[PDB]
Symmetry: C3
Amino acid sequence: MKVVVQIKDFDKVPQALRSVINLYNDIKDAEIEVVLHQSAIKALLKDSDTRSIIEDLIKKNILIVGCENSIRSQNLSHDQLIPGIKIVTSGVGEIVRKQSEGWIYLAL
Amino acid sequence: MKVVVQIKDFDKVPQALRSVINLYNDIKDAEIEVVLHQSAIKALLKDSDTRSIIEDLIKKNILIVGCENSIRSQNLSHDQLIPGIKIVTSGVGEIVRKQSEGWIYLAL
Amino acid sequence: MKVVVQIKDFDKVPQALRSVINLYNDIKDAEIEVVLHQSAIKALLKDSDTRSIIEDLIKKNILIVGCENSIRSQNLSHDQLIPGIKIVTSGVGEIVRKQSEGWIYLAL
């Protein structure tokens, strides 16, 4: 079950991440990709309060993706992001493309 | 027309419910399922300010679903929820599954 | 690539519009329709702070759509909206219908 998850609001990241954990626990063999854009990109910073949760999702083989446009608008450096994070040119472009590829969309 | 509606933010429930009413009025013979998770689950409490609206949606044959994970994290009891409410193990799992079954997704 | 974009929160319109610009720049020959409903409808007012951005999207051949139900609940007049704006009876009905027609959904 392929699911492309979107997270855009930084203030809702904690709840969004718990929801992703819920998804993982509920759908057997789920193939999950989480795309963070807009202000939510800040959650991928090395000193992020949700770093341990993000690292746990990575351990669970979940693909964590950050939006380049968002990284740039938030004045962040790739050097400052959690290691092992994939980046796409556009978070919204990725979300749309994955859906066209058959991935089920979930907005958090 | 099968539509699976998601509502996750408690502070936006009033507007979300009005939007569902709008959907109902706009799409003839719509088959609607509303899944509430995260903080929005509180709207399904018996003393909820939106109870009368929820009851009206039920009257209109709309399926109202509450997330068990969310009920648990909000420390709520099934005894405290509006009668006639269906519950799923995971709100996000339900949203994803209905979409895979052909239901059109609407995030409110 | 057909994409139906939803924007419902007025306080998030600036970021949503930038995200639409990002979509446009990222997906070659994207066919985009943006549906604004709930409080976001206010962004289509003639004296709107985002008017110039909306006009730019229109220039880029992006279809800008406003929800009639939302226009009514916000006590707005069609005379007060940006010229060239299309209106639908229900923003949510449009979002659902476009998806059933094969348009990819993006919630902003």
